[PDB]
């Protein structure tokens, strides 16, 4: 009928590519009948529509400027001023894609950092700065080669791929596609679509990208892929090549104060119609940072300023008081809730077995408390709390040091066959391949067996090797940031990471009093309430 | 057909968008030729009936005041005194930007709670306060876009979606659609019921939301949508963003007695025509609350009072002799029968191996009676009833504290290799997850091994760590509503939550008698009824 | 000839509505020719043959009274004592709030039961009491709204809906219309027939009930509908509300003998053409009930007694010898051929590995038998035959209870590490596969391990908790009705259910014998013939 007229004109109201035109005229050969009824025309309808709605070889304009790009990139969340150099170096790699116009065997810009620190804002800034468009696909919980690839074109209700879905939305084949959480792909049911994303993510394979709900492979050559991920090593290992590690580290408190006064809170006030009626003094911004969110990103702070703006809308719709209200740090909890975090956690009044430890998580940096119970028995060892064997052998190494140092620290003649040990660590292994918490467990076990109070407010990290030698670790900047944002002021380190301390800004170093030591007896000296 | 002339008029009198004018006049130019129509006359005639009846350009007034909505939301069900403030905050934000400033990217008030606590009534109360026509749409068991969208325009058959019907009924273009039960909606059959919800969610896209029984995208810009879920867990994740969460939990008992004197027992005595002739004392309302239903909310209390009303109609229609009945707590069972439940918990005879945790299932809170058997055997452990390793960590932590302190509870000196344990959790699938039953299982295990009875009548909750400390648990208010409904009168919460404890409205802290602890030795001096 | 004359006279003589008079004019327009055949006008004469017969305001004088309806419902079956009370409450409410149509939207009487019991006899008794005119319509299995609503007079098959046939055969506007098997109505076709009966249910849209054959939609204002199902869990959920569960169970033996003596067999005699020639005492009716059919209702008694009476007529054909041919249970397989069912299910060989639980299918009650094979091996459990997690967990709980008490039951003092158990259930596909066979499996496992006889002729239901207890189970009346169908005389019930044992009729308790327990100790002292 006229629906057949529409789906028949769409064969030549969209000028198709050659093999696509061939299978389209075969779709019309199955057509020229009722548009509904039998199910073989309905699967023909979804097949025709999904193949004649995805756009065919059309693109946006493109810029080769760095100056206007620099202008826009200096206004995302305060401008990071260091990693934008790295992004300008990658866009200088775009300044050499000449012979074969892809430049793979070459980076693709994975963006690594805690969730929401401007990564998506960097994507939006690049999208505005190249006059492109933007779209997101989140790969969270992907294990299926019909989510990414096609599904069997023999059913009504089979699925086109997510990638072809998102390309069906955007009308060109140069969007900026944001692949969010590329690390959380899996392989449980119907193959591993990591190889599918690889075939998306090559020089000369995307331009004939294989589909199976689309029975011709579809051209995806010119899409500016941009990719973000929390971890660094849970990424598919052959796909870990052809990349550029853009580290976006976490912020500090003063930078988030600047972001609040300049970028966040003006949008929060304009998103509740209170232009010119509410203002916040900056000690209250310090209050919101230092008592109401403990993270590395700036998403929760945006929620808090949103709550304050919405309450201001209510209190001004119930009687117009003044031209300018001022909200100091006194009456934040009139507008917000209870103070959910104390600014001084130094009122913990040190524990007995607990070791305060630093940690490298996929969401960046955090603290931990390693929790050790020394119970009577016959001598064993157990570690719980979803740990891996790497933490277990690090504890093995710690005990191997401990067995040769009995009477020097307040321990029995032995504990390898008298005292059972149960160790909880609140998270498991590190995504970096290594237990970065050797001396943490060592101070915990020595504190619990010695029955001597381990001091809190002394965060620490560092390994204990099989020789008991304290080893240099990686990613030190983020654990130092995590110790900074909780207000912790003492760090125990291996000495050999001090070159790592060359890449640390000043205000972080003003509070972190570093004890660059080299052996396990030295943290036992500098930590416990006894001098040993 | 002069009715066909009327069809042409009712097309050509209501002011349409001119694309609808185009397609409707084309349907008139391809009708009036199949007068004996096999469905070509029929489907086109029903199509033009839909293009006449569906509301195009239909005006309806509005509030501009937060204050009249205060005046009206004191007259539905109660005041409820927390959620009234959140509703007015959302409307205060909506008022100061109405007039279409560019900040129309707003969330849409999901109302999470148990079934039947005043959600649809709250929609009706808001819709009275705005003078817009309320209407509901249920989404319980929606799986395919033939239900959200149209499916077949070809022959008369598959209808348009739910939305065009529920706009056709309401004579104006701006209802208050209540989309109930948005979490039970799932992709059951082959089809996507989530992305259509994301399209009706977003205020940029649904300016021209479309279906398939019609061929102009409909103008849904002015519908104040509002949804309703019972569980925040299983909501699709692209929908859980852009979603204002307002949490309505259940009522305490004295609020149930007050709602039943105000709004429920008079409408029930209206509903069975026996006004001014049946009388219910407040002890009777309290008896029917406490001894005949346990659900959170007031569904069951409606059905109970309906039964008393209809029985009164029967007893008066087999003889009229009075001026007025008078029920009290004496003759409830004469109208209802044997009590489904029992009186208060204070007579429930202390078991030797049982603990009464608190929980919040999404159909209302509950007690849990976790029961633990101490089987004389090897020394290993066993867990049944829908448990992962979270409960094994809790059991092992509490058991480690006991292995430290066998002297402190009359235990034998050695039972890691004497006694097996068999733990049975009665509801292992409480979806508000976590080890929030730490001293629950610690009390059960120390009761089962010490042969000394754990008391009933005292609820408790918390977490445990290997040193033997009680950490805080989140969600104090839902735990106290469960402990206040199910009949308990003594609660043991962790010490770390007393700053949370004054957050409550002071209804909830009336009957309850909180014993705040911080270590497991305190709850095992409370709950163990004899000395050891 | 003058068929046009008589029809124009009739259409003016039959009282039309005025809009119906206008559509009668537009049907009249195509007339005035005196030739037959007439493929347009044959449809017209048949349409007016329908339209001169549908009732327009003919009334039957309804009596209100709730005492006449009871003095007529005492001439239905032997006595139901519960559903007659519920029908008196419902019709009492419809006696007060009638005419006072401020209150409306009444529910519509779902009558739930096994097929066979007096559904339509309760319908006809109500219709005798109100002096209305009963007429059924069976709406089980219908998948098409073109059958329930009208049908198009544009291709041949120009018929009204079923409901206009039911209104043609009733010459008034206030009948009692019954809708048998409203849940067997399927929905796999063009037109969901649930929405049609939602419209017929509707007390507002009934006034313009749409037909695709009649032009003006019809009114269903006073038609007192009433519905029937078999289980209320397959009705669609909008239609499930605005129902009233009046739940009819099956009968015991004395009730079926009384129904056959009082009511059935005089009908089946005097419908045969025979009268006063046969004598049947209690023995033959006892035999025909117990050893010839396996149903809940009374279809089988009706059919078999009618076949007996017809073959008694056949024997009377070859001689009118005597007016008294006394029949009893001895000589009855003369008339019915071979008896089908065994005489004794009570004497069922009190052996070891057998357990005899009470259950119920939704065509009538049943007895589950449960086997346990106690083989040597490693110690692990096997469940085949529709055995999920709850039955296995109840088995595991019973096994733990045995491990607590190995001394006084003749067990091996360590058996859990030595004996494998194949627990087989033939019938888990029969409903309620959850825990109601707790002491069933406790007796099965205790006998199959202790190699002591588990008794026939004692039945049991309930649950077991882990410390060793018996919980209560709901729905006591259906279970004891099943136990009095299938021929047992001893029942084990929990202590906790004892209160519900005074909601039953007193007849059920004297044919049976209820052995209440509270623990597993009492049921293990009951059911072992030798105990050690």
Residue numbers in the entry:
A (entry chain A), B (entry chain B), C (entry chain C): 243 to 774
Quote the study's own text.
The Lon protease is a AAA+ protein found in prokaryotes, archaea, and eukaryotic organelles. Lon is involved in cellular protein homeostasis by degrading damaged or misfolded abnormal proteins, which prevents these unwanted protein species from forming toxic aggregates. Lon is known to form a homohexamer; each protomer is composed of multiple domains, including an N-terminal substrate-binding globular domain (NGD), a long-helix domain (LH), a three-helix bundle (3H), a AAA+ ATPase module, and a protease domain. We show here, using cryo-electron microscopy (cryo-EM), that the activation process of the Lon AAA+ protease may involve a pentameric assembly and a substrate-dependent incorporation of the sixth protomer to form the substrate-pore-loop contacts seen in the translocating state.
